[PDB]
């Protein structure tokens, strides 16, 4: 063999960071995806006049 | 107080003396609509202005929405021809609107820097044209 090591051990840490970030975002968004309580129109926005 | 101090209902005149409330109501509706449109055409959210509004009634007065509400107050009070209640209405609305205008003015002075400062230097009169 003539082949010594290649691209890095640092960009592997970068792609591992990206993988972990996306994995945690998916894990979080799979649990707290739906919490809807109410949607009342603010047809009396008091800061405009009062 | 305008209702009570005002005279009895059917004795107020007509003809050419009831054109003043017409034109004053038209003016206050026009000026309020212009103020609200010029305030809302720039803001992204409900009240989040991006630039400084210095067009329409804003180039006559620093707070035209409040002065238009003031003017329709005066319009109701003048339709029944009662000056003292108009004056007391003016006093209380001046006090509260001036307080709220002072907080909002210092907020946009802090937030916008020199822009609202030069805008206020261009037009000083806060509520009434060259009276307040």
From Swiss-Prot, chain A:
Disruption phenotype: Embryo defective. Impaired plastid biogenesis and thylakoid differentiation in embryo. Defects in the photosystem II protein complex formation. This is Probable inactive ATP-dependent zinc metalloprotease FTSHI 4, chloroplastic. Homooligomer. Interacts with FtsHi2. The chain holds residues 806 to 855 of 855 of the full protein. Functions in chloroplast biogenesis and chloroplast division. Required for plastid development during embryogenesis. Might be involved in chaperone functions or play a structural role in the thylakoid FtsH complex. Belongs to the AAA ATPase family. It is found in: Plastid, Chloroplast thylakoid membrane. Ubiquitous but preferentially expressed in young leaves.
